[PDB]
Design a protein around this ligand. Structure first.
Ligand SMILES: CCN1CCC(Nc2ccccc2F)CC1
Ligand SMILES: CCN1CCC(Nc2ccccc2F)CC1
Length: 460
């Protein structure tokens, strides 16, 4: 049986509003309802991996697992294996996979982050799962961020705390947060960003929703506007939204948005909003295609509607040669020419680079670069032609061209990373000087750039 070069991944996010689900939730896993929906002809085709995020989940892990497995069994006639389940308070993530993938899946990690201090610590945060699928690293984050239309800044801070402190993936990648540790990272949940229009416009907003005219609403969506000003989710993607706001509904129908202020809401309006979202970040030049993004119409136990997203994701095999793993392939090398980092730092320390990749036996430290002044104030760290020659474990181009090099620029004085980025080895040519580029981030904020030239030698 050949190893796959593609898998499909189902991502679900549902704030259950502390109510048990209805007897049937199959529409969710079939991507049926409003938005970008899945073709009927695919209904019997199982996804390879289902990742279910819930918020305000009132069920035990046992109760929810039984509902999910029995749901997928009804749809597919396949009994899915439980990869991982992790719960923080009422925030939960479940990863289920087809039984044929059981021995393709390894290095399963779970973690949580609690957001806020005192008052604000006690029910918001994130849970996550990572694992290897053959040669491909996969991360999944389910976050329930701070609620309320006037707290978008608090949501942005929650995001930064989650991506700083969630401990998933390969701990040897010590300079890198979860936004660099995975071939494919999916981040979903009740992100709680609102449509920021005046309260007096509520009935107008409802009108627009009934006409399926979402354009003037999405232009005020706080997640889209914060993302466009680079305040949150920098270098993440989201599919176009073509489904009605998923919050806040009267329960047991979808015909009414319950937006007016009530004692139960802390006297806060809940204008119709896209609270419930799926975003992703994959390494450069890896295949990832969103094939559905929508909401269910028939699951009405919560004041939120479930959201689904499905993806095709490129995956690689667990490569063995005569040489690597367990030695180098002297027919392989990665050289860096005319390289320099540009940093927004106001500091003056020497800097060096670390190169991290699963194509190397271990990470590689460079010599210190040469600091120069940029013409517009910037620090420019010149490496020129001084960067070491990287020695991959496998020289076969069918392996090496599918790999990536993570780069950290570190202070010589503190050994703290000032910027992290990623370079694809999926080059237009081998044995050829080619431009490379990555933005550099730290705690998910832009800190600089790394650019130069690469020269990749493979066995071919
Ligand atoms: C040989 C590696 N090994 C394979 C099984 C894996 N566990 C697992 C994978 C997928 C579904 C359910 C599971 F329990 C733990 C590590
Ligand atoms: C170079 C890739 N990049 C270009 C388009 C950009 N678009 C965007 C950013 C923030 C909010 C809404 C958006 F549509 C996102 C990805």
């Amino acid at each position: 049986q050949p190893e796959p070069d593609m898998i499909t991944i189902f991502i679900g996010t549902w704030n259950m509003g502390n109510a048990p689900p209805p007897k049937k939730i199959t529409s969710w896993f079939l991507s049926k309802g409003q938005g970008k929906t899945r073709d009927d002809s695919a209904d019997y085709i199982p996804h390879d991996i289902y990742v279910i995020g819930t918020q305000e989940d009132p069920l035990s892990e046992k109760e929810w697992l039984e509902i999910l497995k029995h749901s997928l069994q009804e749809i597919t006639s396949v009994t899915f294996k439980t990869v991982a389940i992790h719960t923080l308070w009422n925030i939960r993530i479940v990863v289920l996979a087809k039984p044929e993938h059981e021995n393709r899946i390894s290095h399963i990690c779970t973690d949580n982050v609690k957001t806020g201090i005192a008052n604000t610590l006690g029910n918001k945060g994130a849970v996550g799962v990572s694992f290897m699928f053959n040669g491909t690293s996969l991360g999944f984050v389910n976050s329930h961020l701070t609620s309320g239309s006037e707290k978008k800044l608090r949501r942005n801070q929650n995001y930064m705390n989650i991506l700083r402190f969630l401990a998933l993936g390969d701990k040897k990648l010590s300079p890198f947060n979860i936004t660099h540790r995975f071939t494919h990272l999916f981040w979903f949940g009740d992100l709680n960003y609102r449509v920021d229009l005046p309260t007096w416009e509520a009935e107008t907003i409802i009108q627009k929703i009934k006409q399926q005219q979402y354009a003037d609403l999405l232009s005020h969506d706080q997640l889209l506007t914060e993302r466009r000003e680079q305040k949150v989710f920098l270098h993440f993607e989201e599919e176009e939204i073509t489904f009605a706001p998923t919050y806040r509904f009267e329960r047991l129908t979808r015909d009414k948005y319950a937006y007016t202020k009530q004692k139960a809401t802390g006297m806060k309006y809940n204008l119709p909003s896209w609270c419930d979202r799926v975003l992703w970040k994959s390494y450069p030049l890896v295949h990832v295609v969103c094939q559905s993004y929508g909401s269910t119409s028939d699951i009405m136990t919560s004041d939120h509607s479930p959201v689904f997203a499905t993806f095709e994701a490129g995956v690689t095999s667990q490569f063995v040669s005569k040489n690597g793993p367990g030695t180098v392939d002297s027919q392989g090398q990665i050289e860096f020419l005319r390289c320099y980092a540009t940093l927004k730092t106001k500091s003056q320390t020497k800097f060096y680079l670390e190169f991290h990749s699963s194509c190397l036996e271990s990470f590689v430290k460079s010599q210190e670069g040469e600091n120069e002044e940029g013409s517009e104030g910037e620090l420019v760290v010149k490496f020129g032609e001084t960067l070491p020659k990287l020695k991959p474990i496998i020289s076969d181009p069918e392996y090496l061209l599918d790999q990536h090099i993570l780069i950290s620029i570190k202070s010589s004085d503190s050994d703290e990373s000032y910027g992290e980025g990623c370079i694809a080895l999926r080059l237009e040519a081998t044995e050829t000087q080619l431009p490379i580029y990555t933005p550099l981030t730290h705690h998910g904020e832009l800190t600089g750039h790394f650019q130069g030239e690469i020269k990749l030698q493979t066995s071919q």
